[PDB]
Design an enzyme around this catalytic site. Sequence first.
Site, PDB file in Angstrom:
ATOM      1  N   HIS A  91       0.863  -1.182   0.000  1.00 45.54           N
ATOM      2  CA  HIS A  91       0.000   0.000   0.000  1.00 45.54           C
ATOM      3  C   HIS A  91       0.907   1.242   0.000  1.00 45.54           C
ATOM      4  O   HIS A  91       2.131   1.064   0.007  1.00 45.54           O
ATOM      5  CB  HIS A  91      -0.864   0.064   1.263  1.00 45.54           C
ATOM      6  N   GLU A 103       6.479   8.839   5.157  1.00 41.96           N
ATOM      7  CA  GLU A 103       6.456   8.632   6.606  1.00 41.96           C
ATOM      8  C   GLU A 103       7.870   8.759   7.129  1.00 41.96           C
ATOM      9  O   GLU A 103       8.217   9.619   7.925  1.00 41.96           O
ATOM     10  CB  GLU A 103       5.829   7.255   6.847  1.00 41.96           C
ATOM     11  N   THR A 196       2.779   1.754  11.510  1.00 43.88           N
ATOM     12  CA  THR A 196       2.696   3.191  11.541  1.00 43.88           C
ATOM     13  C   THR A 196       1.268   3.723  11.757  1.00 43.88           C
ATOM     14  O   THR A 196       1.118   4.944  11.768  1.00 43.88           O
ATOM     15  CB  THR A 196       3.248   3.901  10.293  1.00 43.88           C
ATOM     16  N   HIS A 197       0.349   2.783  11.952  1.00 48.44           N
ATOM     17  CA  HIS A 197      -0.934   3.204  12.496  1.00 48.44           C
ATOM     18  C   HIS A 197      -1.494   2.194  13.496  1.00 48.44           C
ATOM     19  O   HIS A 197      -0.949   1.119  13.601  1.00 48.44           O
ATOM     20  CB  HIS A 197      -1.888   3.439  11.364  1.00 48.44           C
TER      21      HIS A 197
HETATM   22 CL   LIG Z   1      -2.634   1.007   5.411  1.00 49.17          CL
HETATM   23 ZN   LIG Z   2       2.205   1.651   5.721  1.00 52.36          ZN
HETATM   24 ZN   LIG Z   3      -4.217   0.806   7.034  1.00 51.23          ZN
END
Ligand SMILES: [Cl-]
Ligand SMILES: [Zn+2]
Ligand SMILES: [Zn+2]
Length: 257
Positions: A91, A103, A196-197
């Site tokens: 993604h 990021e 990262t989330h």
């Molecule tokens: Cl994602």
């Molecule tokens: Zn990612």
């Molecule tokens: Zn996601």
Amino acid sequence: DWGYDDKNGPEQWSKLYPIANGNNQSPVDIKTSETKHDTSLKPISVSYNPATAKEIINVGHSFRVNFEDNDNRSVLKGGPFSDSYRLFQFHFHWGSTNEHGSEHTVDGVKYSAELHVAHWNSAKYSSLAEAASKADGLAVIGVLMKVGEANPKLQKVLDALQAIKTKGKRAPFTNFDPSTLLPSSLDFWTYPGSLTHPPLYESVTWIICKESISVSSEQLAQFRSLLSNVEGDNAVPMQHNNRPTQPLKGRTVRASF
Ligand SMILES: [Cl-]
Ligand SMILES: [Zn+2]
Ligand SMILES: [Zn+2]
Ligand SMILES: [Zn+2]
């Protein structure tokens, strides 16, 4: 749930997900004068099978391409790893304008977007779900995307987006080898870090390519044209989904090169 808006976004994630201030948080700034050489790092080898590609999905904050992960048709090995890791997904992340979408950052420089290619440790664990919380369970390749010329390797991906415009839509996405998105040099940095989330689990070995890949300003426009709302509701464009960089908390970034 959690999201990227002022009320539910990254600065706010610690209320529900306390590990966000942990010691192994991802998005980091890679300072090149502070990385360490390692002679034990093997080259990174990727061998993916295009027939593992399965589906593209709009998940509201972003979009994902999922791959069949029932066997080792598509694996990452070498680098810092002794176990082979199984590809399950790729993604992108991008920002509101060209100036900041990545990021990871390198010496403070922000790129315009970032590709993530995600894998799970199938020598130790039996499923992605078991692997996802384990310190050694995830391996992710990050590639920085520098706005400039149209990247033609994105074509199949960008042409599929019109079929998954709103939250929850999904469609077949088949016969695709995501090693074609990678840079031609595979010099990398590695460090121990996190998703990262949310959940933000500290389960990821990151592999950051030294070499960026291109993307045009119009190709980033197509990502931002995706809709975070469900069909029928008012259009709400998915303008960004990148987290701020996080403190290294004493971790060492190692360079392969
Ligand atoms: Cl994602
Ligand atoms: Zn990612
Ligand atoms: Zn996601
Ligand atoms: Zn915003």
